[PDB]
Design a protein around this nucleic acid. Sequence first.
DNA 1: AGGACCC
DNA 2: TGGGTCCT
Length: 372
Amino acid sequence: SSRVIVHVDLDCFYAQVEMISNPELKDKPLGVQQKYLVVTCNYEARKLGVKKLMNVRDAKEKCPQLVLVNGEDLTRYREMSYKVTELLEEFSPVVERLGFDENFVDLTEMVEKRLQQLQSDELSAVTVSGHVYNNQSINLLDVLHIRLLVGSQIAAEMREAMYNQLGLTGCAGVASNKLLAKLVSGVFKPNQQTVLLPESCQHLIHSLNHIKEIPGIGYKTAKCLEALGINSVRDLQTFSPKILEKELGISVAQRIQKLSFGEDNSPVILSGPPQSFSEEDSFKKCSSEVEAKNKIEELLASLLNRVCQDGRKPHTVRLIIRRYSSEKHYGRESRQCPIPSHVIQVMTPMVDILMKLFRNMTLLSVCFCNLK
DNA sequence: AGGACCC
DNA sequence: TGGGTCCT
């Protein structure tokens, strides 16, 4: 019936990794750069105006002192990301990754086992760990409150472990489903945690300022809802099911309307090993359609070392590209093809293997998928 | 192959 | 605007 889900969200992840590499970067405003962008920065620099995904220029003309480290090679970020996930899996096996810095853990079973260990007395001593959303009063006789509180305790144990064993700080949100857990994890933003009691669900959902802010409603859907006059969470909650169903599909429509009410029955999915491996690269439009495949040889280099390490082998390869011109807000192409059973068991072959797929066709990326 | 959505 | 996942 009722679940206890925790959402773990690491603070400015790349920055934390770069700060751990070179300690001299601490306290000093740090920004991690990829090409001409500052993807993320530590809180210090953030205090000085630096915002995530901001042009270097606008970043230095806002903080003419900001230090920058290149973060185009995701290798170390990716490695730490899995150590975090594995550490969480130790607490409970059902852990879902969302990007490199977020994880969802279904704590339901763990909470039950812990509660069954408590005696008819110490159950009244159950306390919360961290913040209680909207400073809501706890009712120790509400079984749902007790469960979420134990959930807050586990969350605190997880964050303490991440810090002690891995040197990382982060936020956590504890709630009855993934939607709410993710929305509440960020209420007290820096290295802290919050728990959501049922009675405050509407307050949390309505605290949002636009449907776009709801996890599960992307750039597209948002614009669709807008063209319909739906802008606030309450608009969506009160809109006609039928029309919404008749314009977004019965699937999408019924799902996002549930979300507007803070309802979300999606299960936390066990991520396990990656379903694919890939590396990209965007050039200043410097690929003459030919000879510029030496770049593809570079991508393959690292990948091959990665595809290797994992142990499993990929039975499919792919190549994706881009083209410069107008304002193509969306434009990618890729030629998918099977990988020779013999070559699976090295570059040379694969090189021209991608080369043919090449000709058949500002960015270039090789993706090894269909792992077995 | 391409699309939507997410960090 | 460097990676990923799942659905059509």
